[PDB]
Design a protein around this ligand. Structure first.
Ligand code: ADP
Ligand code: A9E
Ligand code: MG
Ligand code: MG
Length: 265
């Protein structure tokens, strides 16, 4: 069906481990979209074909305003191309680098949008497992969209692939290679809420080996400016024992989220 010849390619939108992502326009319709380019030698080398397949199958069948659409894919003997919805206001990561920290109202609205999207995923027993600022994109009204389903799965699960880069968003069960379920996305939602308010994630350290210790002990503290209601929410989410983390309905109905968020359930 689609091939490269059908698109005019434009400026680079970003880079990941594998993905080189470009703005593009479809020639006959003039439809503007994002083309995510993957090199086949590099997918074969890392042995992550099953991850690409999961990304395509899970993301193309989900439909939610706070989840990024995938429309299709094609392939050309050196490259695989994923046809994505274009997010014009860029990443939450870039926005945090611009502002240093978010205020309480911005933070609670993003958390509501995230918990809405995750509640929808979990209702299909899809776990994302890689929630972090560079995988959250922003639509034309500034609304948050989860993207990058390459690590996503059905629960319950173990981890059969090597963690590559940062431990900062992963919970204890996951870094210790244990078994895990839906509740890992709850833990990453705690880490995000802290990083939005403070400017850095709560277990950040200078080495892999020390980050690993801080996470497995849940060693975090709060700066004076973080309010009592923020603290309460974050402290309920960052629990070592996954079963004690709240359900997402409890997150969306937490008093501090209802006082501060400018969007609903
Ligand atoms: N649909 C898109 N619209 C705008 N920018 C995007 C989009 N998808 C990816 N990007 C940019 O490209 C980066 C890498 O995309 P990603 O899908 O997260 O690749 P990887 O799987 O390699 O992490 C993102 O962090 C963001 O900067
Ligand atoms: C090749 C470029 C391309 C573009 C679009 C597409 O589907 C578009 C589509 O379903 N909607 C439906 C929701 C609103 C508009 C987008 C498939 C391929
Ligand atoms: Mg990514
Ligand atoms: Mg990926």
């Amino acid at each position: 069906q689609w091939a490269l010849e059908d698109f005019e390619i434009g400026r680079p939108l970003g880079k990941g481990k594998f993905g080189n992502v470009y703005l593009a326009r479809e020639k006959q319709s003039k439809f503007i979209l994002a083309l995510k380019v993957l090199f086949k030698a590099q997918l074969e080398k890392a042995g992550v074909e099953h991850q690409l397949r999961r990304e395509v199958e899970i993301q193309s069948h989900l439909r939610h305003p706070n989840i990024l659409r995938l429309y299709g894919y094609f392939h050309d003997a050196t490259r695989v191309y994923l046809i994505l919805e274009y997010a014009p206001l860029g990443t939450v990561y870039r926005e945090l680098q611009k502002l240093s920290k978010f205020d309480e109202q911005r933070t609670a609205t993003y958390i509501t949008e995230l918990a809405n999207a995750l509640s929808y995923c979990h209702s299909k027993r899809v776990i994302h497992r890689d929630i972090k600022p560079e995988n959250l994109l922003l639509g034309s009204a500034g609304e948050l969209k989860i993207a990058d389903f390459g690590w996503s799965v059905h629960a319950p699960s173990s981890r059969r692939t090597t963690l590559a880069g940062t431990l900062d968003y992963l919970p204890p069960e996951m870094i210790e290679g244990r078994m895990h379920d839906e509740k890992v996305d709850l833990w990453s939602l705690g880490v995000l809420c802290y990083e939005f308010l403070v400017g850095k994630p709560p277990f950040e350290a200078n080495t892999y080996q020390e980050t690993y210790k801080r996470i497995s002990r849940v060693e975090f503290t709060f700066p004076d400016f973080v309010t009592e209601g923020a603290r309460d929410l974050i402290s309920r989410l960052l629990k070592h024992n996954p079963s004690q983390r709240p359900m997402l309905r409890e997150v969306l109905e937490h008093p501090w989220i209802t006082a501060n968020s400018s969007k609903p359930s």
